[PDB]
Amino acid sequence: MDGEYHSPYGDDDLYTVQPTERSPRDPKAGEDVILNITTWPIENGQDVWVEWTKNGVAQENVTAAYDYNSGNNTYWKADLGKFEKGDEITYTTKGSTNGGTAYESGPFTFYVTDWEYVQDVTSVVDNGDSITLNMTATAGDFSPKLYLSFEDLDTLRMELSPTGKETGHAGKSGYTVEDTAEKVTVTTEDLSIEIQKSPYRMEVHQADGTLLTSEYTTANSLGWLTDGKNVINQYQNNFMTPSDEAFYGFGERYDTINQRGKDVETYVYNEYQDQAQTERTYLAVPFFVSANKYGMYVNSDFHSQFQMASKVEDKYSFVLDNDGDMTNMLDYYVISGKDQNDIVNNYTDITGKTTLLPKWAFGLWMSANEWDRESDVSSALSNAKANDIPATGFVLEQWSDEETYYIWNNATYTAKKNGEAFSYDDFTFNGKWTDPKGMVDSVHDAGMNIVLWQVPVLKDDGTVYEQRDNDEEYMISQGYSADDGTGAPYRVPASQWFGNGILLDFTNKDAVDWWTSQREYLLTEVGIDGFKTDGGEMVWGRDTTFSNGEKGQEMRNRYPTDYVSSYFDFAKSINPEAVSFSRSGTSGAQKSGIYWSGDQTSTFDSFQASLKAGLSASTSGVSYWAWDMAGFTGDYPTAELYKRATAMAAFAPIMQFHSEKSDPSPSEERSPWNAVARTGDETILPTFQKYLYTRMNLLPYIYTAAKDTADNGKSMMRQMAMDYPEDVNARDLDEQYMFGDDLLVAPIVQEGQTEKEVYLPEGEWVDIWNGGVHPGGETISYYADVDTLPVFAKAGAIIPMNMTDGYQLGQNVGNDLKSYDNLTFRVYPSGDSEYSFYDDVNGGEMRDISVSEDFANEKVSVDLPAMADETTMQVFSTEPTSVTIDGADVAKADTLDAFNEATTGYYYDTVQNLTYVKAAAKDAKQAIVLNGVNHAPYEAEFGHLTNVTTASDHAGYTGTGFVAGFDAEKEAVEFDIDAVDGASDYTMEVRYSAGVEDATRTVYINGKKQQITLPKTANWDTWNTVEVPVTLQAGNNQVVFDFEADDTAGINFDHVVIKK
Ligand SMILES: OC[C@H]1O[C@@H]2OC[C@H]3O[C@H](O[C@@H]4[C@@H](O)[C@@H](OC[C@H]5O[C@H](O[C@H]([C@H]2O)[C@@H]1O)[C@H](O)[C@@H](O)[C@@H]5O)O[C@H](CO)[C@H]4O)[C@H](O)[C@@H](O)[C@@H]3O
Ligand SMILES: OC[C@H]1O[C@@H]2OC[C@H]3O[C@H](O[C@@H]4[C@@H](O)[C@@H](OC[C@H]5O[C@H](O[C@H]([C@H]2O)[C@@H]1O)[C@H](O)[C@@H](O)[C@@H]5O)O[C@H](CO)[C@H]4O)[C@H](O)[C@@H](O)[C@@H]3O
Ligand SMILES: OC[C@H]1O[C@H](O[C@@H]2[C@@H](O)[C@@H](OC[C@H]3O[C@H](O)[C@H](O)[C@@H](O)[C@@H]3O)O[C@H](CO)[C@H]2O)[C@H](O)[C@@H](O)[C@@H]1O
Ligand SMILES: OC[C@H]1O[C@H](OC[C@H]2O[C@H](O)[C@H](O)[C@@H](O)[C@@H]2O)[C@H](O)[C@@H](O)[C@@H]1O
Ligand SMILES: OC[C@H]1O[C@H](OC[C@H]2O[C@H](O)[C@H](O)[C@@H](O)[C@@H]2O)[C@H](O)[C@@H](O)[C@@H]1O
Ligand SMILES: OC[C@H]1O[C@H](O)[C@H](O)[C@@H](O)[C@@H]1O
Ligand SMILES: [Ca+2]
Ligand SMILES: [Cl-]
Ligand SMILES: [Cl-]
Ligand SMILES: [Mg+2]
Ligand SMILES: [Mg+2]
Ligand SMILES: [Mg+2]
Ligand SMILES: [Mg+2]
Ligand SMILES: [Mg+2]
């Protein structure tokens, strides 16, 4: 025999086992315990056995039985049997051939556990900032204590000490307690916590009595797993959930946005390509938000499983792991708030706010793994310029020596001992990188900022590489690695990414300072703008030990966030504009930069999973989220996928293209120019440009939303039920979302699709591209060819934009981040609305703008704050008869050219039905009033048409044209029209031409019929308006025009307008 091996926990992997583990790893009462053992080489006459004690008494040896052979190894199973709660088992596994040299593993000890639950509350002590509930247990000898405290008046914290020896934390004092024999009720202005005493059972209500959530009906819901003496290994609680309850968040999830029915693992993992199918993630957070208006956060870095009505149809549960330490309390929060987004804000109060990034982070990021030399960077920049792609971010991955990851590829130098840091001048730059500082300067010259790829591991591939070997020696001599549990440095398991590499212990501040010192010259001298901090899902092994005294079970989920945060803070300390770009983390990840959705293939299925990842991350407080648009690997995307992806990406928090392959031919860049080359579809370029230019037009809105995340916890991109939690149609939507406060975005994420269903919540929505009006409260069908993205603005929206003199979306304003071209506010008037604009160009002043819509009196008023810039309003309305600024008349400009020349003025855009109003910069509020205005027209051409078509061959129409002829039976034009100012009689203006003869049409108003007379117009180039009395109810009204048997003559039908 050459050896024997058994190790009960293997690498402690959640998903797999090594072939030499104990099963179960942590045996409970009544579970059969199997030991898997290996010997080598394969030989006759081998004996494998187990020497062991039960509660200190030597047992008869167990003989292991042959199981299987693989390679030059035999695998064996030894059966120890079942045990009782409290049993302490110690064993050693042994092997030898024909009574020769004996090889052994162990000794190993396990303590056999079972569940104990809270039984009754026996007394309650109110300490003014905390409440102690003294408890009995269902089994065992503990005297548990549950501590209640308020993180705020709407955020409840539970801390359980099974032994009673630990004490909970103080919280707010603003509560009262009604403590009776049978029940204790804890009340704040926001919450009513009702706790039955016998059996103990908690219900969490809002202050008005509405139930948020509650412990399971049968009580004994809250428990711990113990041997009663040495260990507590798990905690659980169990809660009642009705059949319609939806559960969102849990970090970044690829499979679904609503986790009901699933067991969700809070476990970071590097899963390539098939995250959705395996239900794995790089970014796992033990926090969810329910559409029943609460969130739950289990405050622990240990692995937890959330069982979301996956076992019992009306029960959800959490099972939280522990390392055995009996002094670690269970700590969790039930989180209420003013609305769903406020629940997320309260969660970020606990775990950390998003840090506002510089505005350059919100432009296009360009990346490709194949970029590996200065000529590649030069050509990326010149390709972007030649194709009018004004990006702001630039990533280099294949930049380094591929050994130290802090030295440029091909650089030569005198190696340094003892981990001493390099300066720029220590290097002779050669080959692929002759002048890194110059290269960076060229990136900056293009208006871009650059980040460099990093990992948290010291690579050790077993080869000789002087500087890396020097650094490894130094790192070990200082104790800068984690420890494997035996005194040796922890290494990533050999089969994994960077296997054999030594992790830097990011819990050790000295270690971090050393590691970052080696990169300092990249920031201070080369002038980089941050790091793409990749990896981090690299902590395996229960005995792996960190400088904070924590071990592998506790640190696996936390490690990536320690790593990412260390680098983010370090880069920012030198370069205040630095940005991190990362994939892995847990609670608190949001403090430290951008998160991208990792490694996915270029398919529509992947696109679907990416969108779910962003929407779940958003609920989990990770707002600055990116994805590799159209996928970074697999076969090159189709033109269709590339175009659909581009549109979504332009309307996502962070826009970035990227590609996996390191030296491919042809190129694998997901750049728009390479996509044209690879697909042969030249129309990719103008479509990409449209969406990129539109994003840059919206940058003032986007960046205000980024600040709103940082300040108020409102994520930039949100699943519909975050804004509409009571809306039954919004619960499961995963192919549309809100972007900022105002825009409903509905990407096409299905191959071959052109009829996109869009669910519109109650209220009026307006198509931002063309002014099409859509009353809410139904699913509409929107025709979207491959170049088209349905996007709608909600009623009352005030949307800041940076426009060219053309004043249309999708016109290139460039990538200047320090000035505006034409600062513009797009307004959809509806009652009184207000918006706080983040004017970052002018010192970050908040500009409070308000609009008062009064269409009943044919007026819209805008209260413009003091501004540093000329401003243009674009107000969705009919053409005013006059406009005043501070009471002073402003003249109508007849053309766009005249408007651009004017200092102040107004202009009416007939295509978009937008009134442009130009106001000078002034260090004082300005009152703008639009007079004689009504709600914008309902264009006939945007109506539901039956057997009738559109044209535009006679000038003077509004919108894009008119409905032509409309002069046979079974032809109809249907409008969905909102009552502008509630249920009332109104006048419907019908604008038409009838160049040959008097016409009539029939109209139905919510089923009520009348015939209208449309007198002849002089010719087909003359429009007239007839006023029709109608009666409209609140909200959406069905207005149907048709041509019936008693109607006559052709018309061209331009629009209708509703006015008082
Ligand atoms: O040149 C730097 C670096 O480039 C490549 O990795 C960057 C890549 O990392 C992340 O995805 C990776 C994935 O590409 C793949 O990598 C395996 C690969 O790792 C090393 O080489 C990397 C490049 O892949 C190189 O150092 C190693 O030398 C090589 O032998 C290996 O084949 O798989 C891992 C494991 O799943 C994955 O994490 C990142 O997500 C991605 O955006 C980035 O492009
Ligand atoms: O060039 C003459 C004429 O040609 C086209 O119409 C052919 C059509 O004419 C007569 O019926 C029309 C009817 O179709 C409808 O036309 C509305 C239409 O009028 C003008 O364009 C038409 C052509 O379509 C043109 O005059 C106008 O430019 C366009 O914008 C309008 O949509 O209504 C009128 C009035 O009731 C009627 O005269 C003719 O009777 C019929 O047989 C023939 O097919
Ligand atoms: O394919 C040769 C390549 O293999 C290894 O690197 C690859 C890397 O190039 C990348 O390839 C993506 C590619 O993977 C499969 O071939 C798949 O069928 C295809 O659709 C997809 O586009 O990613 C994989 C996985 O990360 C890497 O293994 C070698 O490292 C490299 O030397 C070789 O050139
Ligand atoms: O720390 C290892 C090594 O780094 C530099 O050399 C890098 C590289 O230089 C040339 O390209 C050679 O052809 C390669 O063999 C080298 O790896 C230092 O100059 C060198 O002193 C040092 O040992
Ligand atoms: O939101 C309004 C409308 O937008 C698109 O259609 C625009 C299209 O409408 C008519 O066909 C006009 O004649 C054209 O000039 C316009 O471009 C969507 O496809 C549609 O579904 C939506 O209702
Ligand atoms: O093993 C290290 C190698 O990994 C990948 O293949 C990289 O593309 C290459 O640049 C590097 O030399
Ligand atoms: Ca029209
Ligand atoms: Cl144990
Ligand atoms: Cl891995
Ligand atoms: Mg709050
Ligand atoms: Mg290259
Ligand atoms: Mg700088
Ligand atoms: Mg130490
Ligand atoms: Mg689906």
Side-chain angles (χ1 to χ4, degrees):
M1 204 180 269
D2 289 338
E4 172 278 344
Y5 184 80
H6 168 76
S7 184
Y9 308 120
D11 288 324
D12 198 47
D13 197 85
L14 182 61
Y15 301 120
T16 63
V17 300
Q18 298 300 108
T20 52
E21 291 189 19
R22 173 170 73 228
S23 188
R25 286 179 182 155
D26 300 309
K28 295 188 265 290
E31 301 189 327
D32 181 50
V33 186
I34 301 297
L35 310 177
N36 297 286
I37 303 161
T38 196
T39 58
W40 64 96
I42 297 163
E43 300 180 304
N44 293 347
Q46 290 188 341
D47 296 308
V48 178
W49 73 96
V50 188
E51 299 180 3
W52 66 300
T53 66
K54 170 161 88 166
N55 300 321
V57 177
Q59 302 298 298
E60 294 300 305
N61 291 356
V62 167
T63 293
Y66 158 93
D67 189 21
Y68 64 95
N69 287 312
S70 186
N72 209 13
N73 284 59
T74 304
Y75 293 85
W76 310 77
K77 286 182 178 288
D79 188 357
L80 298 185
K82 307 166 169 183
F83 298 101
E84 300 183 305
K85 183 183 176 192
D87 285 346
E88 175 185 333
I89 309 308
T90 300
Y91 67 90
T92 298
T93 63
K94 292 198 188 174
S96 66
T97 304
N98 297 324
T101 302
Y103 296 92
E104 64 172 50
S105 306
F108 303 111
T109 299
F110 64 90
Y111 307 94
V112 179
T113 56
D114 209 343
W115 289 99
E116 299 176 352
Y117 300 93
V118 171
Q119 177 52 58
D120 294 345
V121 177
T122 57
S123 61
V124 180
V125 175
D126 183 356
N127 294 116
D129 59 10
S130 171
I131 305 169
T132 306
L133 313 175
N134 295 295
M135 309 288 208
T136 52
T138 56
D141 53 330
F142 296 170
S143 290
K145 295 182 179 268
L146 182 57
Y147 301 94
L148 310 180
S149 63
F150 292 99
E151 186 273 335
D152 202 354
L153 303 181
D154 59 8
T155 300
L156 176 66
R157 187 185 193 174
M158 255 70 56
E159 295 171 276
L160 176 73
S161 171
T163 67
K165 292 172 184 207
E166 297 74 45
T167 300
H169 290 88
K172 305 299 200 190
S173 53
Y175 65 83
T176 57
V177 176
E178 187 56 38
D179 185 17
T180 67
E182 305 83 6
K183 191 184 194 181
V184 57
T185 302
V186 189
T187 304
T188 71
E189 68 178 18
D190 304 320
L191 290 173
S192 181
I193 311 306
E194 303 186 26
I195 303 164
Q196 290 300 319
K197 289 194 177 178
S198 182
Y200 158 77
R201 188 170 167 272
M202 178 180 294
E203 299 184 350
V204 182
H205 301 246
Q206 297 181 326
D208 72 357
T210 306
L211 177 61
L212 296 184
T213 197
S214 60
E215 286 171 344
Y216 200 63
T217 315
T218 45
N220 303 308
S221 70
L222 177 57
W224 52 96
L225 179 64
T226 187
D227 75 333
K229 293 184 282 197
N230 297 100
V231 303
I232 292 167
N233 285 340
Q234 287 191 323
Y235 285 107
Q236 72 176 273
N237 205 353
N238 297 269
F239 304 89
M240 192 274 284
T241 170
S243 289
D244 65 336
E245 191 175 13
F247 302 103
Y248 308 111
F250 306 87
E252 181 183 36
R253 304 287 167 174
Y254 297 73
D255 54 347
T256 182
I257 57 91
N258 177 1
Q259 299 292 333
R260 194 192 189 81
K262 294 201 184 280
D263 291 314
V264 183
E265 309 297 340
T266 312
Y267 188 73
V268 304
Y269 197 86
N270 172 18
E271 186 66 24
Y272 178 85
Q273 290 185 178
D274 65 349
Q275 303 86 352
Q277 303 96 305
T278 60
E279 315 186 347
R280 300 177 186 174
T281 184
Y282 312 94
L283 204 178
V285 176
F287 168 59
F288 72 82
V289 170
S290 166
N292 288 2
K293 307 180 174 177
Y294 68 91
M296 192 177 283
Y297 172 47
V298 177
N299 182 28
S300 176
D301 290 331
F302 287 103
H303 165 252
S304 55
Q305 185 182 69
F306 285 85
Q307 306 175 350
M308 307 310 296
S310 57
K311 315 290 192 198
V312 176
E313 67 189 346
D314 69 341
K315 182 180 301 182
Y316 74 86
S317 313
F318 67 78
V319 181
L320 172 69
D321 294 351
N322 192 46
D323 64 353
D325 185 343
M326 298 181 82
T327 71
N328 290 336
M329 291 184 287
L330 174 64
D331 183 6
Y332 70 100
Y333 299 79
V334 178
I335 308 175
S336 182
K338 295 175 211 83
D339 64 26
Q340 304 295 90
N341 296 307
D342 197 43
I343 290 165
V344 178
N345 189 59
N346 291 343
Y347 162 81
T348 64
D349 290 337
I350 299 159
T351 65
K353 304 285 162 183
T354 290
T355 302
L356 179 59
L357 296 178
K359 193 157 73 188
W360 73 262
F362 300 93
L364 174 67
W365 294 66
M366 318 198 310
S367 181
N369 190 257
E370 68 195 70
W371 298 339
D372 72 324
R373 61 200 74 201
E374 287 169 332
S375 63
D376 286 350
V377 175
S378 191
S379 290
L381 301 175
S382 56
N383 285 335
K385 189 185 217 274
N387 291 280
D388 304 313
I389 301 302
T392 61
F394 197 102
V395 182
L396 281 179
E397 297 191 333
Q398 197 178 175
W399 70 272
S400 78
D401 64 8
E402 301 285 337
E403 292 295 353
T404 72
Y405 296 95
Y406 65 81
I407 296 174
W408 290 85
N409 207 1
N410 305 154
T412 55
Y413 52 95
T414 301
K416 284 177 184 209
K417 299 279 194 197
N418 307 318
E420 301 156 38
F422 293 87
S423 306
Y424 193 79
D425 290 356
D426 296 324
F427 300 104
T428 300
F429 291 110
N430 306 289
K432 293 169 179 166
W433 309 98
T434 60
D435 181 6
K437 181 164 41 193
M439 182 278 295
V440 169
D441 289 347
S442 78
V443 174
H444 291 156
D445 290 340
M448 306 192 200
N449 310 74
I450 188 169
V451 305
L452 302 185
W453 188 90
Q454 292 287 272
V455 285
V457 63
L458 183 129
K459 175 172 177 166
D460 189 345
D461 56 9
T463 72
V464 172
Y465 203 81
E466 188 177 15
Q467 188 59 48
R468 180 275 304 289
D469 297 335
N470 288 354
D471 288 353
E472 170 168 334
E473 162 195 298
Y474 184 68
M475 141 177 223
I476 300 156
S477 82
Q478 304 305 297
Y480 288 170
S481 72
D483 192 272
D484 74 355
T486 71
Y490 168 78
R491 297 173 180 268
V492 174
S495 60
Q496 305 300 336
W497 193 38
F498 285 89
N500 203 53
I502 302 172
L503 293 184
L504 191 286
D505 183 356
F506 287 93
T507 78
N508 180 333
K509 189 207 159 180
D510 290 342
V512 173
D513 289 350
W514 169 64
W515 188 269
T516 60
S517 78
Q518 300 186 295
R519 282 89 182 154
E520 188 199 321
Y521 85 102
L522 298 166
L523 294 148
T524 58
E525 299 178 288
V526 183
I528 70 170
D529 307 288
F531 298 102
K532 179 173 182 181
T533 32
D534 198 355
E537 316 88 349
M538 287 167 168
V539 178
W540 278 273
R542 292 201 183 186
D543 283 355
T544 304
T545 309
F546 297 78
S547 75
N548 60 0
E550 294 182 19
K551 294 191 186 181
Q553 283 165 288
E554 200 172 6
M555 282 290 311
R556 182 175 170 88
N557 292 350
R558 176 55 48 202
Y559 184 83
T561 298
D562 284 347
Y563 152 54
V564 170
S565 61
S566 289
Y567 265 89
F568 179 72
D569 292 347
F570 160 71
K572 202 175 170 179
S573 80
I574 297 168
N575 177 359
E577 297 272 298
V579 172
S580 292
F581 196 104
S582 305
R583 67 176 197 199
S584 188
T586 193
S587 57
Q590 67 278 9
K591 304 169 66 179
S592 305
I594 292 160
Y595 291 84
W596 95 97
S597 72
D599 297 344
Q600 304 186 261
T601 54
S602 297
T603 68
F604 275 97
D605 281 341
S606 295
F607 185 10
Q608 291 166 13
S610 296
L611 180 53
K612 297 176 196 175
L615 294 175
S616 51
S618 168
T619 296
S620 309
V622 176
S623 179
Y624 302 164
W625 176 92
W627 64 306
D628 304 333
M629 51 159 282
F632 96 138
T633 196
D635 291 331
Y636 201 82
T638 62
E640 184 188 9
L641 173 62
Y642 192 86
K643 287 184 168 180
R644 295 309 195 183
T646 295
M648 186 280 247
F651 283 87
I654 304 293
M655 183 185 198
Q656 180 247 196
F657 71 72
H658 183 45
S659 55
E660 188 168 20
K661 289 196 174 179
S662 68
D663 186 29
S665 186
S667 178
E668 289 292 332
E669 292 178 17
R670 271 66 170 160
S671 60
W673 60 86
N674 195 53
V676 168
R678 292 297 305 275
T679 65
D681 187 347
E682 296 171 317
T683 72
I684 284 168
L685 183 64
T687 299
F688 190 99
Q689 290 170 337
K690 181 170 75 175
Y691 289 109
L692 177 56
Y693 301 160
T694 299
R695 182 183 183 81
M696 298 313 275
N697 297 143
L698 290 173
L699 189 59
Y701 174 82
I702 292 171
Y703 199 51
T704 295
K707 184 165 192 288
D708 197 36
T709 293
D711 295 342
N712 301 310
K714 183 151 176 193
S715 292
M716 289 172 75
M717 174 169 69
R718 296 181 312 293
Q719 195 282 330
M720 299 299 300
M722 300 303 299
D723 288 12
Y724 303 95
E726 301 183 358
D727 189 325
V728 299
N729 277 103
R731 290 287 175 95
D732 297 311
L733 301 174
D734 56 7
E735 308 187 354
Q736 67 181 74
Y737 53 90
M738 304 298 303
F739 190 54
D741 301 322
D742 297 316
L743 299 181
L744 189 164
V745 180
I748 289 63
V749 300
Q750 297 172 31
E751 177 179 348
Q753 176 178 28
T754 55
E755 284 299 322
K756 173 61 174 181
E757 286 187 350
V758 187
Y759 175 66
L760 293 185
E762 299 285 346
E764 186 174 292
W765 298 87
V766 181
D767 182 323
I768 68 169
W769 309 104
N770 58 39
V773 180
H774 302 276
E778 67 186 42
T779 303
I780 65 167
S781 184
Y782 187 107
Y783 174 70
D785 70 22
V786 72
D787 305 308
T788 299
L789 179 68
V791 183
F792 311 82
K794 99 209 279 193
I798 295 157
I799 303 164
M801 294 176 184
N802 186 26
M803 299 299 229
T804 70
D805 281 8
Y807 279 108
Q808 302 295 337
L809 292 171
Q811 298 175 329
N812 186 12
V813 83
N815 64 355
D816 186 353
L817 308 177
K818 299 183 187 297
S819 69
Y820 307 115
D821 186 349
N822 298 319
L823 176 62
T824 299
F825 296 91
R826 175 71 68 85
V827 174
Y828 296 94
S830 178
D832 290 345
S833 57
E834 58 202 335
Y835 180 73
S836 190
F837 173 49
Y838 181 45
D839 186 359
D840 69 303
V841 168
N842 301 110
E845 286 282 304
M846 303 304 299
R847 312 290 187 186
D848 295 329
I849 302 154
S850 59
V851 175
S852 186
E853 169 270 305
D854 186 20
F855 288 138
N857 296 108
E858 296 189 332
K859 286 173 63 173
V860 171
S861 298
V862 180
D863 290 334
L864 190 78
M867 311 284 286
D869 298 279
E870 179 178 275
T871 54
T872 303
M873 307 303 307
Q874 290 187 334
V875 186
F876 191 57
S877 69
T878 60
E879 184 177 351
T881 53
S882 70
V883 177
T884 55
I885 304 186
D886 295 333
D889 190 75
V890 304
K892 184 185 172 174
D894 293 323
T895 69
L896 185 58
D897 287 12
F899 182 74
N900 287 318
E901 295 231 314
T903 308
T904 66
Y906 76 102
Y907 162 77
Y908 186 70
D909 177 345
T910 63
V911 171
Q912 296 287 329
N913 295 304
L914 294 169
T915 303
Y916 301 12
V917 180
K918 186 185 279 187
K922 199 166 189 296
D923 199 18
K925 300 201 288 281
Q926 293 180 275
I928 303 165
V929 177
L930 289 65
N931 296 118
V933 285
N934 288 109
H935 185 284
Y938 288 85
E939 298 301 335
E941 58 268 32
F942 302 154
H944 293 346
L945 304 189
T946 304
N947 297 323
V948 80
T949 52
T950 63
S952 61
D953 61 330
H954 299 288
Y957 55 81
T958 63
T960 61
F962 47 86
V963 170
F966 184 19
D967 66 338
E969 291 174 82
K970 289 83 165 53
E971 299 186 358
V973 181
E974 179 187 22
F975 300 87
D976 278 19
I977 290 182
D978 285 321
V980 185
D981 297 303
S984 190
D985 284 355
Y986 290 89
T987 297
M988 176 173 67
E989 291 188 344
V990 176
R991 185 161 192 259
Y992 72 97
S993 188
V996 171
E997 65 198 313
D998 289 350
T1000 63
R1001 294 288 182 284
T1002 301
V1003 53
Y1004 297 82
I1005 307 296
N1006 300 310
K1008 190 178 184 172
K1009 190 179 66 148
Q1010 59 181 297
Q1011 191 175 48
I1012 71 180
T1013 296
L1014 304 169
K1016 189 193 174 295
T1017 59
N1019 55 50
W1020 295 107
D1021 296 313
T1022 301
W1023 298 95
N1024 185 45
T1025 297
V1026 301
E1027 292 196 357
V1028 181
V1030 298
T1031 302
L1032 303 181
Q1033 294 285 163
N1036 190 7
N1037 294 262
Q1038 176 190 72
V1039 175
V1040 180
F1041 285 77
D1042 66 8
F1043 188 97
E1044 302 196 352
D1046 64 349
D1047 287 317
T1048 195
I1051 70 176
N1052 290 341
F1053 183 12
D1054 181 19
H1055 71 228
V1056 304
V1057 167
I1058 303 303
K1059 64 179 177 186
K1060 225 64 174 276

